[PDB]
Structures are given as C-alpha cells and as structure tokens.
Amino acid sequence: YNDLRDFLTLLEQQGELKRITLPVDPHLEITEIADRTLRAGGPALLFENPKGYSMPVLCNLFGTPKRVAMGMGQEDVSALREVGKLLAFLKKQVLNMPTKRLRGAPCQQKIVSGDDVDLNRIPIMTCWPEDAAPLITWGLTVTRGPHKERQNLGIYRQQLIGKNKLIMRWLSHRGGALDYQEWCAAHPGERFPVSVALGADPATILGAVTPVPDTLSEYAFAGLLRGTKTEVVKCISNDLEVPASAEIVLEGYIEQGETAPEGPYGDHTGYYNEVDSFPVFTVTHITQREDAIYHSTYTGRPPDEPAVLGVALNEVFVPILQKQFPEIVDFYLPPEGCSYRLAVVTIKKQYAGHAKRVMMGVWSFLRQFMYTKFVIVCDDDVNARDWNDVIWAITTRMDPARDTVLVENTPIDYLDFASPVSGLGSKMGLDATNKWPGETQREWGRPIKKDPDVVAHIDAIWDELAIFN
Amino acid sequence: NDLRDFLTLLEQQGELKRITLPVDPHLEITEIADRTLRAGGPALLFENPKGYSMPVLCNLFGTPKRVAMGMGQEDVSALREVGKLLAFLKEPMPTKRLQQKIVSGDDVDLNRIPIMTCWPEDAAPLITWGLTVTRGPHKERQNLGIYRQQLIGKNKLIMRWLSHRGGALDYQEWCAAHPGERFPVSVALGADPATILGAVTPVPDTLSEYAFAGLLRGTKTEVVKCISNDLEVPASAEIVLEGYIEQGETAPEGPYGDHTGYYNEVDSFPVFTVTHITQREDAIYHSTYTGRPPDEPAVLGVALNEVFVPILQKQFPEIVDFYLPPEGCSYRLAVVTIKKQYAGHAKRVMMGVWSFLRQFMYTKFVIVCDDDVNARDWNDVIWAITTRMDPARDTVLVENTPIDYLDFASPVSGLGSKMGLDATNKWPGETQREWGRPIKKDPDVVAHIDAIWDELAIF
Ligand SMILES: Cc1cc2c3c(c1C)C(C)(C)CC=[N+]3c1c([nH]c(=O)[nH]c1=O)N2C[C@H](O)[C@H](O)[C@H](O)COP(=O)(O)O
Ligand SMILES: Cc1cc2c3c(c1C)C(C)(C)CC=[N+]3c1c([nH]c(=O)[nH]c1=O)N2C[C@H](O)[C@H](O)[C@H](O)COP(=O)(O)O
Numbered sequence: 036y037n038d039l040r041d042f043l044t045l046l047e048q049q050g051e052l053k054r055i056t057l058p059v060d061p062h063l064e065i066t067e068i069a070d071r072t073l074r075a076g077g078p079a080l081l082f083e084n085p086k087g088y089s090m091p092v093l094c095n096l097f098g099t100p101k102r103v104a105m106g107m108g109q110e111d112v113s114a115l116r117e118v119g120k121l122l123a124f125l126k127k128q129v130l131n132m133p134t135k136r137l138r139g140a141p142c143q144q145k146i147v148s149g150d151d152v153d154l155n156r157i158p159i160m161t162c163w164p165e166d167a168a169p170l171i172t173w174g175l176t177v178t179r180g181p182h183k184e185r186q187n188l189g190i191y192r193q194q195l196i197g198k199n200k201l202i203m204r205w206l207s208h209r210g211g212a213l214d215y216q217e218w219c220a221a222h223p224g225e226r227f228p229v230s231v232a233l234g235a236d237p238a239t240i241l242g243a244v245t246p247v248p249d250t251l252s253e254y255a256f257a258g259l260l261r262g263t264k265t266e267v268v269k270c271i272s273n274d275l276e277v278p279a280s281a282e283i284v285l286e287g288y289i290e291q292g293e294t295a296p297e298g299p300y301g302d303h304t305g306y307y308n309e310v311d312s313f314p315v316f317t318v319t320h321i322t323q324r325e326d327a328i329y330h331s332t333y334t335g336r337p338p339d340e341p342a343v344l345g346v347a348l349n350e351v352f353v354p355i356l357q358k359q360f361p362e363i364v365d366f367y368l369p370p371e372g373c374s375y376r377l378a379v380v381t382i383k384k385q386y387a388g389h390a391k392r393v394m395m396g397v398w399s400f401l402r403q404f405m406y407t408k409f410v411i412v413c414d415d416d417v418n419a420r421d422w423n424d425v426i427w428a429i430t431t432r433m434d435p436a437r438d439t440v441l442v443e444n445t446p447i448d449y450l451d452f453a454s455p456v457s458g459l460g461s462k463m464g465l466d467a468t469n470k471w472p473g474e475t476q477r478e479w480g481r482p483i484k485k486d487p488d489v490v491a492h493i494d495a496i497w498d499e500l501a502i503f504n
Numbered sequence: 505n506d507l508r509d510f511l512t513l514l515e516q517q518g519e520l521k522r523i524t525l526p527v528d529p530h531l532e533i534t535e536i537a538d539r540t541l542r543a544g545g546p547a548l549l550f551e552n553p554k555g556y557s558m559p560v561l562c563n564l565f566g567t568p569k570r571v572a573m574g575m576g577q578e579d580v581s582a583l584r585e586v587g588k589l590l591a592f593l594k595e596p597m598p599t600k601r602l603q604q605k606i607v608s609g610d611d612v613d614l615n616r617i618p619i620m621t622c623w624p625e626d627a628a629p630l631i632t633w634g635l636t637v638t639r640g641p642h643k644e645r646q647n648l649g650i651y652r653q654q655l656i657g658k659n660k661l662i663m664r665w666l667s668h669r670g671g672a673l674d675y676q677e678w679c680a681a682h683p684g685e686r687f688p689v690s691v692a693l694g695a696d697p698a699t700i701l702g703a704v705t706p707v708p709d710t711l712s713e714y715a716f717a718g719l720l721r722g723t724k725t726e727v728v729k730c731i732s733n734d735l736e737v738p739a740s741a742e743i744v745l746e747g748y749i750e751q752g753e754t755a756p757e758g759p760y761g762d763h764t765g766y767y768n769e770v771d772s773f774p775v776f777t778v779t780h781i782t783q784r785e786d787a788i789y790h791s792t793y794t795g796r797p798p799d800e801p802a803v804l805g806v807a808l809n810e811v812f813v814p815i816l817q818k819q820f821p822e823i824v825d826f827y828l829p830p831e832g833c834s835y836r837l838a839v840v841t842i843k844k845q846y847a848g849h850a851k852r853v854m855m856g857v858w859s860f861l862r863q864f865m866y867t868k869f870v871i872v873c874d875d876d877v878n879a880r881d882w883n884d885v886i887w888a889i890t891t892r893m894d895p896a897r898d899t900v901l902v903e904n905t906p907i908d909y910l911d912f913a914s915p916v917s918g919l920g921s922k923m924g925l926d927a928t929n930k931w932p933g934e935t936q937r938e939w940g941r942p943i944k945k946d947p948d949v950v951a952h953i954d955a956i957w958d959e960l961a962i963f
C-alpha cells in the first residue's frame with residue numbers, strides 16, 4: 036500500500052522529485068520557485084529547509100500531467116478515459132467500495148490539543164504579495180451531513196486567522212457547505228464537527244478533486260483508481276475518518292454563526308477576488324507523523340497545479356463527447372484559459388459546415404462547457420495541445436470574417452467581469468477547418484507531406500550523424 | 505400479425521374505406537388521397553385500379569392515430585414510451601426465419617404492377633413504399649430504408665438513395681471492397697406495419713431495423729430468405745422485388761415532386777435491375793406520394809417526433825415540449841417550450857436543437873418560448889414572438905452551416921444560415937425594463953361560469 040512517501044521515492048528515482056536544501060521562505064519565495072518550475076515542465080519540489088520552520092514543504096506535486104498519471108498507478112493520462120466510460124453508466128455493485136479502518140495510524144504519532152495548538156508552527160505559504168494572510172491550499176476537508184453516512188472530501192482554501200482558527204471557504208454548492216447548512220437546520224446551535232487531512236496518498240488526493248456524485252464518497256472512487264480500498268483512521272475528537280497515511284491532520288468544529296472576512300486572495304483566474312464572509316473552523320487537535328512533511332500549492336495566473344490537474348481530469352469527458360459526436364478526435368481545454376474558458380476540438384470533417392455543428396455541441400451538450408467562450412475547431416492533422424499546430428491552422432485555413440461565429444446574450448459565469456452584464460455575454464467560435472467546395476471558390480492548398488522512406492532512413496543514421504555529441 | 509390483419513382491424517373501426525369505382529394510378533389516386541388526408545379521413549383500398557387487377561392501398565398512415573395503431577397502441581401519447589425504449593442505447597433480438605407463392609424470371613414485367621404517377625410533371629411512375637434491404641460487406645446487419653424508385657424499363661428501377669442512407673453506404677463500400685461485382689438488393693412492398701414503421705424510425709446504423717420492429721410488436725419479426733440472394737425479407741410481404749445494382753450503371757432520375765411542394769430537378773442515381781418478382785396470390789400494392797405538406801410522410805414525421813421528445817428531455821430536462829409543424833416541410837422549423845432557469849437559457853437550447861440529434865441538424869428556424877405557450881398553436885407562438893421579442897436583440901443568425909443540398913433557397917448547395925428566435929420572457933440582464941405581468945384569470949370565476957354555462961344557453 037503506497038502512502039505518499041512511497042510515491043515520493045518513486046518520483047525521486049525517476050528524476051521527478053528535486054530536494055532544495057537552500058533556505059527558502061514560505062512567504063512568497065516558494066510560490067515564485069514553483070511557478071518557474073511548473074512553467075518549464077520541471078519536477079515536483081521538496082524544500083527541506085524552509086526559513087523559520089523545521090517541517091519540509093512539498094509542492095508542485097501534480098505540476099505535470101505525467102505525474103498525475105503516475106499518481107493513479109498508470110504510465111499515461113488516458114486511463115482517465117476509462118473512468119469516463121464508467122461514470123457514463125451510472126445515469127456496478129462492487130463500486131459500493133467502503134474504507135478499510137485501521138486502529139492506529141502514523142498520522143497520530145504526535146498529538147497536540149487545546150491551548151497547545153499553534154498553526155504558526157506549520158510552514159503555511161503566503162502565495163501572492165497582496166494576499167490577506169497565509170493560506171492552506173491542499174487540505175482534504177472531510178464532513179458528514181446529518182441525513183446520510185457518506186463522507187465528502189473537498190479541497191477548500193483556508194485562511195489563517197489565529198493560533199487555532201481557519202476560515203473555511205467553501206462555495207455554497209460544495210458537499211461540505213451543504214452538509215453544514217443541513218446540520219444547522221437539523222441541530223440548531225450545535226457545533227459542526229470537521230477534520231482536514233494534509234498529505235494523504237495520491238489516489239485519495241486525486242479522488243477528492245474528481246467530480247463524483249454527491250451521493251458517493253470520494254474515498255470509494257480513490258479505491259477504484261488504486262485497485263485496493265482506501266485505508267483510513269477514526270479521528271480522535273469525532274467520528275470522521277481520515278487517511279491513515281496523512282502527514283498532518285487538523286480536527287475541530289465550526290461554531291454556528293461564527294464567520295470572518297476572507298481574503299482578498301489571488302485565484303486561478305489570475306486576479307484577486309475581493310473580501311467576503313465565510314465560516315470559521317476552530318482547531319482543537321493537530322495530529323501528525325514523526326518527520327511530518329507539509330503538502331502545499333498555490334493558485335494564480337494559469338497555468339498552475341490546479342489547472343494541470345483540471346486538464347488531466349477533463350480526459351474523463353472526451354469519451355462522453357465522442358459517443359455523441361464520433362467525428363471528434365480530441366477535445367482540450369488549455370490550463371492557460373482558466374481551465375474552462377477556451378476549448379480546442381479536432382474532427383474528421385465529413386461535410387461543408389460541419390465545424391459549426393461541433394461548436395454548437397460544445398456549447399450545448401454538457402453543462403461543464405456551457406460557459407466556454409472560445410471554441411477553435413480544426414482537422415485531425417492538428418495536435419490540439421500544441422499552439423504551433425493550432426496557430427498554424429488558424430493562420431492558414433481561416434478568413435477571419437467568414438469563418439468566425441459570434442453569438443450574443445449567452446450564459447456566462449457571473450464572476451467573469453469581462454462580460455458586459457453579470458451572467459450574460461458572447462461567445463466566439465473559430466472555424467479553422469479546411470474549406471470544402473461551397474465554403475470557398477478557391478483551389479485549397481495541398482499540405483507538404485514527408486516521404487516516409489526518407490524519414491525512416493534518417494532515423495537509422497541519426498545516431499551515427501551525431502549532431503549533438 | 506401481418507398487414508392484412510391490420511387492414512381488417514382498421515376496417516372494423518371505420519378507418520379503412522374500399523373504393524370500387526375505376527380509378528387511374530396515373531394522377532387520380534394521388535388527388536383522392538390528398539383530399540382524404542387533408543380532411544383526416546380513412547386509409548384507402550382501391551379495389552378497381554383502371555388497367556390493373558392488383559388493388560392499390562394508400563394513405564395507410566395518414567392520421568397519427570393510425571400510426572399509433574400500427575405500433576399496437578391505442579393512442580398517439582403512447583409513442584413517448586416507445587421513445588424511452590429508443591433512449592436505452594448506452595454501453596459498458598434476431599429475426600425468426602421461416603408467405604409469397606408466385607414467382608417470375610424473365611417474364612419480369614413491372615408494368616403489370618399499378619405503380620402510381622403522383623404529379624402531372626413527374627418523369628414516370630414511381631415506387632414509393634418499398635422497404636429496400638441491403639447488407640454491406642463489413643457487417644451482418646441488414647438495413648431497411650425507404651427510397652423512391654423510378655420506373656425506367658420492364659425490369660429496371662432507379663434507386664434514389666441519398667448518400668448518408670444505409671443502403672447507399674453499403675453499396676459504396678461494396679464497390680471498393682469487391683470491385684466490379686454486382687450488388688445484391690431486394691425490396692419488400694406491403695410488410696406488416698411494425699416492420700414498416702421500424703424501417704422509417706431512425707435507429708442506429710449499428711442495429712437492424714428488423715430488431716426494433718420486434719420490440720414494437722412484442723414478437724420477433726418473421727422473415728424468409730430471398731430466392732436469388734442471402735438477404736431476408738418479411739414473410740408477410742405482399743410483393744418482393746429481387747435483383748442487383750450493376751456497378752457504374754446509372755440513370756437520370758426525375759424530375760419528381762417532393763415533400764417540399766416543389767419538383768426536384770433531374771439527377772443521376774444507380775440502376776436496380778430486377779431479376780425476380782415474388783408475391784402473394786391476391787397481392788395488394790402498397791403506395792403513397794409526397795407533395796406539398798401535409799402528406800403521409802409528414803404525418804409519419806409528426807408521430808415520430810413524439811418518439812424523440814423523451815430523448816431530448818433526457819438531455820435537456822428544461823424542455824417541456826418540442827414540435828416540428830408539418831407546414832414547415834416537417835423538419836425545417838421547430839418550436840420548443842422550456843422552463844427557463846437563467847439569463848441566456850434560450851440560446852443554449854437553440855444550440856442543442858442544432859447539435860444534439862442528426863434529425864434536426866438541418867432545421868433552419870428555431871423558436872424558443874416559455875412553458876405558458878402551447879407550441880402547437882400559432883395563436884400562442886405568434887403571441888409570444890410579438891410580445892416578448894425585440895427582433896434585433898433576440899434573433900440569432902448563424903452562417904455557413906450545413907443545409908440540405910436540395911434546399912434551393914440557400915446561397916450555395918449544402919450550405920446556409922439558420923435563425924433562432926428567443927421569445928422567452930427577458931430576465932434582468934437581458935433587459936433593463938420592467939417586464940410585463942401577464943393577465944391570469946380568476947379560477948373561481950372560471951369554475952362558476954363552467955357551472956352555469958349550459959343554463960346560460962348561448963349557443
Ligand atoms: C485542487 C484544488 C481545488 C480547489 C481549490 C484549490 C485546489 C488545490 C486551492 C485550495 C489551491 C484554491 C482554490 N480551491 C477551491 C476549490 N473549491 C472551492 O469551493 N474553494 C476553493 O478555494 N477547488 C475545487 C474543489 O475542491 C473541487 O471542485 C472539488 O472536487 C469539490 O468537491 P465537491 O464537489 O465534493 O465539493
Ligand atoms: C416514409 C417515406 C420516407 C422516405 C421517402 C418516402 C416515404 C413514403 C417516399 C418514397 C414517398 C419519398 C422519398 N423517400 C425517400 C426517403 N429517403 C431517401 O434517401 N430517399 C427517398 O426517396 N425517405 C426517408 C427514409 O426512407 C427514412 O428516413 C429512413 O429512415 C432512412 O433509412 P436509414 O435510416 O435506414 O438510412
């Protein structure tokens with residue numbers, strides 16, 4: 036059973052983990068280093084010597100799509116397509132796969148509680164210069180509602196506001212926030228138990244962020260990715276279960292009515308969002324391993340680690356789209372487009388006008404892409420994931436005014452300030468397919484194809500040529 | 505069980521009328537059937553066609569009731585249940601092979617059949633209710649389609665399948681996988697109604713239309729091997745034509761009047777050479793026509809839309825009703841009503857009509873309304889259009905979209921624009937005005953008037 040430490044040793048053996056021994060500040064400097072690293076497609080990072088703390092900081096764990104795949108046991112990212120097909124079928128009895136509860140776990144080797152709780156001992160990162168305060172970013176928040184047994188895991192960012200106080204920033208449609216809201220109605224004035232796990236095994240972490248139904252525990256999906264049940268431990272101060280292999284766990288409660296102004300914080304759009312009120316999470320216990328490692332990240336101008344996660348998890352929808360639109364060869368939402376705002380789609384074109392049907396499908400078929408404001412459509416000779424191919428197609432196959440579709444007064448994310456009116460805006464589709472008779476009266480260009488015999492001969496003599504050494 | 509059982513059922517219910525007067529298959533049957541259909545009358549069996557001994561059955565499905573009856577059900581509302589069955593097609597019923605007695609060889613003469621000429625400037629007599637059966641070279645599946653077939657000789661028909669049909673794809677692959685070899689084909693006339701309706705229901709290309717008919721019927725489709733090939737045709741068929749398409753052989757087809765109410769201009773299609781004609785002893789010739797709507801095809805199309813509503817609703821649960829009026833040539837305009845949930849919602853729905861199913865890919869007008877509108881009443885739809893739209897703000901135009909190649913109104917063959925009219929009530933964001941509160945009647949006043957209405961005796 037691979038915990039997180041086993042995963043890190045695997046990565047280190049493969050040149051995918053780098054240890055930094057230089058002093059580095061969790062205030063601002065780690066983010067800067069991780070940002071450069073991720074943008075150059077480099078390794079995961081373990082800062083062994085964080086200025087002013089003894090606990091090492093792990094970040095950029097999933098900064099590469101390969102490492103997302105490795106964290107699910109696989110060679111490559113496509114295994115997620117099979118999960119795509121599985122999730123289709125539920126709308127499979129032994130996907131009622133519970134947790135295996137241990138008695139005793141490394142995450143409860145060192146325990147501290149009540150007045151001894153000091154979150155200031157943890158190297159919590161401050162990501163961006165005008166962020167309100169240090170922020171916990173890779174916590175798996177565990178909750179139960181009052182009406183079912185199911186344990187939801189979510190990643191909700193948590194601002195530091197005291198020795199033993201965090202803000203719990205869950206948006207109102209999240210599992211945690213619904214559970215809390217129901218608890219308040221069903222047990223007026225009673226404290227809401229909550230626990231947060233930092234540094235679980237990778238299948239658990241990836242499972243937390245997969246969009247499974249609210250009906251199902253995210254612990255059960257991680258078991259499917261792993262092939263074995265998720266190993267958990269009961270919390271000390273409540274009946275919630277956290278991953279046995281966790282590096283750190285926070286236990287406590289939300290006092291009903293207690294709230295704090297949250298942020299501003301920089302976020303995945305690359306802007307600061309403005310201040311707003313959220314529940315306060317009071318921390319009564321902190322449990323941890325001997326030698327505990329603090330797992331963290333940051334969100335900002337894309338691409339960041341969340342964006343890269345989002346790209347690997349979209350692979351889930353390609354199969355669902357392809358069932359409906361078999362002409363679709365690939366479907367990609369680049370991280371640099373805030374993960375959902377631009378899509379590039381490649382097709383086997385079969386008739387004049389085909390690109391327009393495809394655009395309308397992206398905008399109508401699934402809800403996850405309802406709010407996608409740019410769609411670029413290309414032929415299957417284009418790698419959707421390489422701007423060198425996509426820009427080539429755009430610049431050699433479009434006449435801008437003929438081949439651009441604009442539609443107005445369409446649904447747009449209320450927080451997208453770039454639209455003229457909250458909730459309402461336009462969308463653009465770019466038809467960059469080759470134009471067929473009817474679409475153009477010109478003689479279209481024949482692309483340059485290489486001689487496969489020449490290519491093969493050069494492969495053979497390439498090492499002997501020794502141009503680099 | 506077979507077609508004759510269905511005709512006796514219809515006759516018992518006053519839905520089949522026998523004509524004993526002499527009536528010409530050249531032009532006159534079409535005229536009679538057209539009046540009958542437009543007044544919602546019965547199916548017609550012409551027992552004495554001028555110059556032939558074989559009776560002509562037409563307007564079989566000229567009423568939506570009769571389409572429902574032909575699927576075993578009482579009512580047109582039952583068609584939605586058939587739609588939910590058709591939905592069940594996610595991921596991870598064969599034929600019963602056993603009649604027709606008399607058979608011909610080189611005494612093949614299609615002139616002995618009362619093939620109809622529909623409209624005065626049609627090129628020639630035209631076979632219009634043939635179930636064309638084909639196999640491709642790559643799978644076992646037998647596709648059934650309805651393709652019109654011009655008479656060009658004693659033993660020659662033109663096979664007018666458009667290129668996206670199962671038959672035309674099967675042929676195209678056969679040529680290429682077996683260069684220069686004759687393509688076996690068989691056409692069944694007058695099969696049982698479940699088989700006929702199964703043929704025209706758009707099931708997947710993966711699936712045989714024989715299997716679906718079995719679900720509508722409740723029992724396996726009973727079939728028989730053809731005499732001259734390995735294709736299987738319905739055992740209860742009244743007439744069967746067997747033969748082949750000679751690769752490369754084509755003929756100019758038409759002009760023929762079409763479901764749009766205009767003539768298609770002349771065009772080339774494969775020739776079907778007929779080597780055998782099999783039939784029942786008292787064979788009945790099943791035929792129809794297309795023209796200005798409404799016609800039998802249009803009525804078929806209206807009943808089959810009821811099948812699709814559930815499929816659309818599964819995808820788009822905000823859709824309350826979805827209707828394609830016959831007067832729009834059955835597919836060219838759709839009216840959709842929704843329970844609107846957010847600003848801009850109508851646009852998502854328009855794009856769904858235009859992208860989700862292929863039957864509506866070519867639909868050039870879409871009108872979207874709220875659920876207080878009956879989609880099927882132009883009084884409601886025009887009301888919504890004229891009280892909830894600002895034309896320029898609320899009209900969506902999209903250019904260079906796929907369009908039916910025969911639609912002469914588009915600027916270029918195969919390519920044209922589409923219009924969506926958002927006639928929903930406008931929510932904050934979509935308008936800065938105070939929207940109008942509609943007049944709702946007092947249900948207590950309405951009830952009181954229902955009670956005293958007869959006593960009032962106004963009529
Ligand atoms: C991976 C990840 C996902 C974040 C996230 C982060 C990361 C690293 C942070 C912590 C770096 C900063 C932005 N985070 C938030 C967030 N959702 C949310 O409501 N508030 C957030 O602050 N998301 C998304 C959210 O956790 C996922 O959508 C979960 O699948 C929600 O699970 P649920 O649907 O069961 O509630
Ligand atoms: C009911 C009906 C449907 C006709 C039709 C007719 C009728 C009476 C005629 C004979 C009166 C006039 C025009 N017909 C043609 C036709 N499709 C086609 O490609 N060529 C045609 O000539 N259609 C539609 C077609 O037969 C159905 O949509 C099938 O579902 C197509 O089969 P497939 O999906 O298996 O390809």
Ligand SMILES: [Mn+2]
Pocket residue numbers: 186187188189210248249251252253
């Ligand atoms: Mn959950």
Ligand SMILES: [Mn+2]
Pocket residue numbers: 647648670707708709711712713
């Ligand atoms: Mn078919």
Ligand code: NA
Pocket residue numbers: 188189242243244245246247253
């Ligand atoms: Na989740």
Ligand code: NA
Pocket residue numbers: 648649702703704705706707713
């Ligand atoms: Na068909």
